[PDB]
């Protein structure tokens, strides 16, 4: 159904955003540490 496909898309996006925020923060932490070398 159209509703089930929306649900499946929503779940996949939840996961991608989690990974994306984790990567953003990890890159931010790296730049700060490097800058404070």
């Amino acid at each position: 159904t159209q509703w089930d496909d929306w649900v499946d898309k929503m779940e996949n996006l939840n996961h991608d955003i989690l990974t994306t925020l984790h990567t953003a923060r990890n890159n931010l932490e790296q730049s700060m540490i490097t800058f404070n070398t």
Binding site: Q2, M10, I17
Partner: protein, 57 residues
């Protein structure tokens, strides 16, 4: 030139991770926007169902 070369390397590294943070953040925004499009679709569809129910009453 070791010291200077090292610290220039660090400066470049900071700049590049900044580009990466910006890329990650723009991508994150793009992802939330995609979720918003889906929610909007779900909401419109539910509204149509509700409208029919109100007529059927």
């Amino acid at each position: 030139s070791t010291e200077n070369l090292y610290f220039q390397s660090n400066a470049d590294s900071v700049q590049n991770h900044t580009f990466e943070v910006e890329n990650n953040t723009i991508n994150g925004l793009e992802l939330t926007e995609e979720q918003v499009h889906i929610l909007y679709a779900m909401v419109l569809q539910t509204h149509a169902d509700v409208q029919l129910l109100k007529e059927q009453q």
